[PDB]
Amino acid sequence: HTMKIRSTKFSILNSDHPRIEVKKVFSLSPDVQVTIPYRRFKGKAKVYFQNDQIQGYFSCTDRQIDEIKISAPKNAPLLEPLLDICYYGSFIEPGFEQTFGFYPAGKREFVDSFFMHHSKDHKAFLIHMGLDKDLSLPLSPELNWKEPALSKVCRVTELD
């Protein structure tokens, strides 16, 4: 049932369809290509996640996150599990349909690149969700839980 990405555990609570594999082909030249498959959702899904003392669920439609609900310690840095969620759904680029600015050799490399790149700069997550003027929302743009800021990550709230 359960899957793991790095230290984050995932359990699908419900979903329209089983997860699908996309076999993405990158062309290096007319007669040389690299195929790097990735998994994603077709239609709707609601998925539980857990990483040590952080947990919650997200809802998505295809490759768009619709909401995330979280329980975590005050001031917890949520970058790591949030990138694990992003990987699990193929929610942000680069790393799925887009390369990191050079041709990838295969999946192992492409996964390592994803976590290096987006850990150094996670702006793709902020762009995916959007930023909100509603300062009552819990997630700061640096992805720290309940940190004050002049904007907050859209559609990320505390668990009921």
Residue numbers in the entry: 326 to 485
Task: Show the paper's wording.
In this paper we present the atomic structures of the putative PB2 cap binding and 627 domains of THOV and the putative PA N-terminal endonuclease domains of THOV and DHOV. Despite very low sequence homologies, all domains have similar folds to those of the corresponding IAV polymerase domains. However, the critical active site residues in the putative cap binding and endonuclease domains are not conserved in THOV and DHOV and, contrary to the case of IAV polymerase, neither domain shows the expected in vitro biochemical activity.
Sequence alignments were used to define a putative cap-binding domain in THOV PB2 subunit, even though the sequence identity of this region of PB2 compared to IAV PB2 is only about 8%. A construct comprising residues 323–486 could be expressed, crystallised in two different forms, and its structure determined at 1.8 Å resolution. Once again, the low sequence homology with the corresponding IAV domain necessitated de novo structure solution by selenium SAD, rather than by molecular replacement. Firstly, the so called ‘348-loop’ formed by the β3–β4 hairpin is longer in THOV and its extremity orientates away from the body of the domain towards the solvent, whereas in IAV the tip packs against bends the body of the molecule. Whereas in THOV, Tyr413 is similarly placed to Phe404, there is no equivalent of His 357 for the other side of the aromatic sandwich. Furthermore, there are no polar residues in THOV that could specifically hydrogen bond to the guanosine base, since Glu361 and Lys376 in IAV are non-conservatively replaced by respectively Ala370 and Cys385 (Tyr and Gly in DHOV). Finally, in all three crystallographically independent examples of the THOV domain, the equivalent position of the m7G itself is occupied by the side-chain of Arg344, with its guanidinium group stacking with the side-chain and making two hydrogen bonds to the main-chain carbonyl oxygen of Tyr413. The THOV domain is not retained by m7G Sepharose under conditions where IAV cap-binding domain is and, similarly, no binding of m7GTP could be detected by isothermal calorimetry experiments under conditions where IAV cap-binding domain shows clear binding with a Kd of 2.7 µM.
